[PDB]
Amino acid sequence: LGHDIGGRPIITDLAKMPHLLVAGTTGSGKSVGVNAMLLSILFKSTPSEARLIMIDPKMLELSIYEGIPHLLCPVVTDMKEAANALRWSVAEMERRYR
Amino acid sequence: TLPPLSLLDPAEVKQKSYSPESLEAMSRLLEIKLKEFGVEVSVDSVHPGPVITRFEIQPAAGVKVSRISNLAKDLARSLAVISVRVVEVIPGKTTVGIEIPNEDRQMVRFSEVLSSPEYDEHKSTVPLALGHDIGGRPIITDLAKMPHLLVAGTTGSGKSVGVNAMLLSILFKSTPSEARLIMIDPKMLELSIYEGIPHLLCPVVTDMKEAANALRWSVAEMERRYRLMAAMGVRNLAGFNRKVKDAEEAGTPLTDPQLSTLPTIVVVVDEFADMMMIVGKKVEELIARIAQKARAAGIHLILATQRPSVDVITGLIKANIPTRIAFQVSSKIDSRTILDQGGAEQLLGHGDMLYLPPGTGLPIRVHGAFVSDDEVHRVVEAWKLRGAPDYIEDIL
Amino acid sequence: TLPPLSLLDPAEVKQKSYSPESLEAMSRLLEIKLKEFGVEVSVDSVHPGPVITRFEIQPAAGVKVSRISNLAKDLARSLAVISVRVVEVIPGKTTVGIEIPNEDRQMVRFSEVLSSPEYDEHKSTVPLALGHDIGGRPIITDLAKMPHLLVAGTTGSGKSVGVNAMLLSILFKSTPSEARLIMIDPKMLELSIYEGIPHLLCPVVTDMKEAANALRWSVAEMERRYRLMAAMGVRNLAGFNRKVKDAEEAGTPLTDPPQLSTLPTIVVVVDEFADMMMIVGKKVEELIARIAQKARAAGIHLILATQRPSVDVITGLIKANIPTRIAFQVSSKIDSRTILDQGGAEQLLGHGDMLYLPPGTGLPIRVHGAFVSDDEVHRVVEAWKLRGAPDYIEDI
Amino acid sequence: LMAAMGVRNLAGFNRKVKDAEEAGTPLTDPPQLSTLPTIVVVVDEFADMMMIVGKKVEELIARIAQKARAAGIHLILATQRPSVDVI
DNA sequence: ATATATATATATATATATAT
DNA sequence: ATATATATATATATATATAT
Ligand SMILES: Nc1ncnc2c1ncn2[C@@H]1O[C@H](COP(=O)(O)OP(=O)(O)OP(O)(O)=S)[C@@H](O)[C@H]1O
Ligand SMILES: Nc1ncnc2c1ncn2[C@@H]1O[C@H](COP(=O)(O)OP(=O)(O)OP(O)(O)=S)[C@@H](O)[C@H]1O
Ligand SMILES: [Mg+2]
Ligand SMILES: [Mg+2]
């Protein structure tokens, strides 16, 4: 995540948050922020140790990411199947605890 | 190809109340009166707008703005004007503003707006010439980046003279192969004059059943454009158009997974309230799925209501249209319906608006244009002479 | 043709108007008392009026008005007046105002307002003669510019002598071929004396099961006109009448899409809207909201009359499309904020005082009404029942 | 009955009947016409009548307050704290 | 030191916008 | 259709924080 007001960089492991909430109105850097986070995931982790699920109710926004070897499901672009993919994520959490 | 701007009525000759000497005398009468109250202030510039006049002032060091602000009701009677309004911040400078209303509201005719460098240099398929800012500067907003617009205002407040202004901003700069037009005018007066122009996809809809049909087709065309763009790798319609242009000019005319450059649709809806009152429950989800996602595909909405209450516009629709324009709402709660602020209550009526840019919350006040009946008849005529109304029949 | 302005009652001779000696004495005493409180001032002029006299006083160099607004009570104490209200800013002069309620509050004749040169020259088919302002200038506002109107007040304020003043403004200017009324009265008693005039196009709706029929017809006429304009490329009624006048004066009259004429301006005077909504219910609310959302282009203007217009009476959709509010005195301050959006209409002295709130101005033009005794209205109706036949569109 | 006589308020109607009887016979009614009283509704404790009855009465008091002033029907509401919850 | 100016808490009244 | 929850305007009471 960019630099602080001291010029130094601020890189933070996601699995300590462990959840994140970007926000802010239009024309601020949200898309570029998400892209920077994803490239951060990329240049450090091979698909054998990280995976992704991208769900954007604004279609084609995250479709710049298609064909990545760690893209468990394709870009979920609709509204009906978003909740279904999240139910599968719940079930994966459950089996991952079991 | 585009019709000449001579088809617009030229600028008018006005009384020009504030002659430069009458502005210099007033600036000096302002400095003197400010000095009388204990603030030493030196005027340095003036900006005579169409309705108001921002006297930029450089207050001496140590003079807080609040000292100047609390003297509004006194500068009012000192300068003999109706009401002074101090503006605390002029961005990028060190000067405070003082917005003196004029004794005469000058009309903003539409030929005066398109004669700017902002408009002609503007590189977009859909520009909107809303009107002059309070500083006289022309306001040229790009429809394709708002993206959607929610015009609203009381009866007789200049909405379908500020939608004709937008559509003429579309016509004078874009060819039918650059921006098409869907028009849904339940109240069959204020868009029915755009009959058979080379831009229209479907006739000027008045049958609300056909309006639901048109919006269904718009959703279908939207999702077809998403399929087309996804099956090529581009991100939005702009990259798609540039890519197909480069492929066609590079001797490789592609085929659809030949191919052609797509236009940018502008779904105009005049008096959306009646379309909801007739075929509402068939159109709620269609517009809530257009406004929600139809940015990359290039299907834009112009929803011109009279009051964006939830009964007429469900909160889901009104939450995805962040760029709104208010025309003189009577009460203050109506300003809370269109905007989420006040301001729109105290607008001088004919023309005036409070165009709310997307990212911010400050409403950039804009004095509207004025395209009369014949000033539009001639545009429609001279643009119909250079094309045929190639409708798309299966829309309805 | 049009009845003579002299059919009313003649001008009422002035009632113990303050002789200049007493005004000069009060001006000197005002200056002395304001010098006692350390505020150097100088009375420039004194404007007498029907209710309040306006001591046009001028501060010295460096006198903030707040040092007078706070003293607004001690100035009433040192004088013999009930209370004093200061006008922090006078629109067009350097002076500041000191308003003194007269002891012998006189009245405002209606022939005084009409016979003024502003009514005689007001080039509108539908004018309104509200009455004299503070200083004594006749306030006469066109109705086709509002384009609707919300008369309001409490029981005993004068909101019926006001509607009668508005109607006699309509009648002394407009032939039956220029303004046709649709009167509705739940009280069965107020507007039931205009019955028989040629202007009406339906009996004065007295039984409250026919108000729905009258308003269904109003919407029908609205749609008929709204399509008749559609078939001619016009966008309002002024343009339509200009079209047909140009056709006639060019020898070739247009054709009905028979032979077209000029269309009158329909004024739907709805008295006592609250009891209407409490008898008929939602049968009418739809039609009133429709006439509000439309009928500005078709030339159908809507004058209401309520007690505390609120969502309990007038829905937010109807009350938003009605820009011009005229509020007589009201009981509370929470009540005055439902009409004018600002609580100024409580200090009104009743008996025909109002705060005319134009469409979008923070300062209401205080008008002192106009008394129209029933003798005048009966004589005017008797003059009309002879100058024209009693018309009634029977399919209503 | 007042609109059928051309008079706008109760006092005027009593003046009219008094004059017509000064000149002989009273008005004829759309029997023999006379003078009308001044009804005075007195609702004491108008804070529990809208708790026993509630919705039923309320709009009737509202119509009496709105319309009944030229008809001579007056109203004297006695309460303890007429907040909007009560009135 | 003493009169105002600005923020805050509490209670009423109203208009919207949700839920049953 | 008819009860809640929220935001707003307005009016008091209370301290702090500046003018004179
Ligand atoms: N820039 C302008 N200068 C002068 N008058 C203007 C301007 N813009 C609009 N008007 C006036 O505004 C009116 C036209 O506004 P409309 O669009 O017809 O009203 P509206 O918004 O359509 O209200 P409804 O609800 O559709 S009836 C005419 O009286 C014009 O003269
Ligand atoms: N402009 C005026 N000048 C002088 N006296 C007036 C004026 N208007 C009204 N009055 C007097 O005030 C009285 C009350 O006015 P009304 O017209 O009866 O009030 P109102 O509109 O009838 O109120 P409600 O709700 O109908 S009871 C009249 O009978 C006159 O005596
Ligand atoms: Mg319109
Ligand atoms: Mg009345």
Author numbering:
A (entry chain D): 443 to 540
B (entry chain C): 314 to 570, 583 to 721
C (entry chain B): 314 to 570, 582 to 720
D (entry chain A): 541 to 570, 582 to 638
Q: What's written in the study?
A:
Among them, the bacterial protein FtsK is unusual in that it translocates on double-stranded DNA and is also the fastest known translocase. FtsK is an essential part of the bacterial cell division machinery, recruiting downstream factors through its N-terminal transmembrane domain. Its C-terminal cytoplasmic domain, which follows an often very long linker domain, can be subdivided into three modules: α, β, and γ, with β adopting the RecA-fold that contains the ATPase activity. Upon recognition by the γ module of one direction-determining sequence in the genome, named KOPS (FtsK-orienting polar sequences), α and β oligomerize as a homo-hexameric ring around double-stranded DNA (dsDNA) (forming FtsKαβ-dsDNA). To this end, we solved by electron cryo-microscopy (cryo-EM) structures of FtsKαβ from Pseudomonas aeruginosa bound to dsDNA.
For reasons explained below, we propose that class III.E represents the protein while it is actively translocating on the DNA, and from here on refer to it as FtsKαβ. The conformational diversity within the FtsKαβ ring is correlated with three different nucleotide states around the β-ring. The most prominent DNA contacts in all four subunits involve basic residues protruding into the pore from two loops contacting the phosphodiester backbone on both strands of the minor groove. The conformational heterogeneity around the ring positions these loops in two helical paths, or “spiral staircases,” following the DNA’s helix precisely. Because the subunits seen in the asymmetric ATPγS FtsKαβ structure appear to describe an entire ATP hydrolysis and conformational cycle, the structure directly suggests a mechanism for dsDNA translocation by FtsKαβ that involves rotating the conformational states around the ring.
